[PDB]
């Protein structure tokens, strides 16, 4: 069983987590849009200042098929 005070604390916990992760996704999306527009203007400037390099800017590196990179840890070697 449970009481009223713990239920109220749980509801406030849900509310504050909603606010926290809303700020989280807002900042993530802000970074997304900021660096995406930075790269778009970078490509536009590259096209303007180099008519033969924008064609080779779109090509993709062939070493990404077996991509590999490990995540974080706690106790570094």
């Amino acid at each position: 069983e449970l009481t009223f005070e713990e239920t109220e604390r749980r509801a406030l916990l849900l509310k504050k987590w909603s606010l926290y992760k809303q700020q989280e996704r807002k900042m993530e999306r802000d970074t997304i849009r900021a660096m995406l527009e930075a790269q778009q203007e970078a490509l536009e400037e590259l096209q303007l200042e180099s008519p033969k390099l924008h064609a080779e800017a779109i090509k993709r590196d062939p070493n990404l098929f077996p991509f590999e990179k490990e995540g974080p840890h706690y106790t570094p070697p």
Binding site: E41, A42, L53, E56, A57, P72, H73
Partner: protein, 197 residues
Amino acid sequence: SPWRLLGALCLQRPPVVSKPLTPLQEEMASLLQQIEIERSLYLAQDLEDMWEQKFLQFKLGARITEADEKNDRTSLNRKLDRNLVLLVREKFGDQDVWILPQAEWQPGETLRGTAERTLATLSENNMEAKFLGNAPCGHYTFKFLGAKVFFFKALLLTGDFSQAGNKGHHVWVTKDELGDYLKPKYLAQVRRFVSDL
């Protein structure tokens, strides 16, 4: 017109240590744990004692090797919970600005080749970097005769950063010291394509 061909590279050292959980995330961890027990479906004391003393005997590697240095900006291990960006002071004949590592490229060298050369040009080390694509991350043009500087991006897989006491001024800046070290708008906007996270 006479154009000054200049490229660069905004190196990225990923965080090896995950960021510490905020107390809000700790509260949500407690909540998810308690609901986990609520939803779960079914001499131990000696085993528990042996296991807790096994936990205690070995000391966990500190997640923060940063509090003790306070001055090791040249050290590759300045920060762990966040990314790091290489940043070396440079002195020009007419300018002296804390500038992201640049390099000179020729039309016979492609941008990827210029970046690969820069990987070991100024660091004189055996660092191991990785490139994703030829799409740049920033451009900044300052003229006196035209010029342009391309800020690329790379990720460090591993690094044998020998002779860390280099004659240069390589400082690892994550996000905060960027604006402190790079005043002009052509250099203080690097955070727009540096992953702040």
